[PDB]
Amino acid sequence: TKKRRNNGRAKKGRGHVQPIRCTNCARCVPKDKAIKKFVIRNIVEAAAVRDISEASVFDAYVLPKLYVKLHYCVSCAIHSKVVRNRSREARKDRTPPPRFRP
Amino acid sequence: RVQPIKLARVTKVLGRTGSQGQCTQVRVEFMDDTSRSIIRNVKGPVREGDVLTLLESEREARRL
């Protein structure tokens, strides 16, 4: 049974997509098929900010961040629970999960 | 060279941890510096407001 009309990848008008390596298990996955993370994390912990601010020589010192682009095969993506198997109806939508900002 | 034994006061209970209930994780403020506060996992019954010893300053801090 054809599970997804998308065929599990973004390849629509192409014929071949150059592969990447899974950042976790180093598996060759097509670039448009692997699940991509872009995490903009604080360079320090959420509880270490207060300690660093005391020892910062600059009073108005902006906090640098970390820019990491992760790529995952669906094996490592499911194993790390970054994606989950969804119902037949719930599979179709492509909206990202809510950010839980408030 | 050596950090001495101190005490900290529980402010709020965060929840159980250890996948057995053998430990509870609570937030503790420092009596020496009330602004200074960490989160510590403790064993045994803990409720709000009680003060307990802490043999070392920082060991672990994770969010459940």
Binding site: C22, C25, R27, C28, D51, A55, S56 | S57
Partner: protein, 70 residues
């Protein structure tokens, strides 16, 4: 902190580095603790910069195309 204090150093510019290359770019759990303890031990923190090796395009990553099976 003890060696720097006894050699006459009071501030630091922390330069973080992960494994880099084609390997992992996320620093391990030791990054947060070592950085936090340096400031809490009575030492100043200035500019923090990243020197993680980020290739344009690296060589082949070790493991094989089927990955590290586990």
């Amino acid at each position: 902190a003890q060696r720097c204090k006894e050699l006459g150093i009071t501030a630091l510019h922390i330069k973080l580095r992960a494994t880099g290359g084609n390997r992992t770019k996320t620093p391990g759990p030791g990054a947060q603790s070592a950085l936090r303890a340096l400031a809490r031990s009575g030492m100043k923190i200035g500019r923090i910069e990243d020197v993680t090796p980020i290739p344009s395009d690296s060589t082949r990553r070790k493991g094989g195309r089927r990955g590290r099976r586990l």
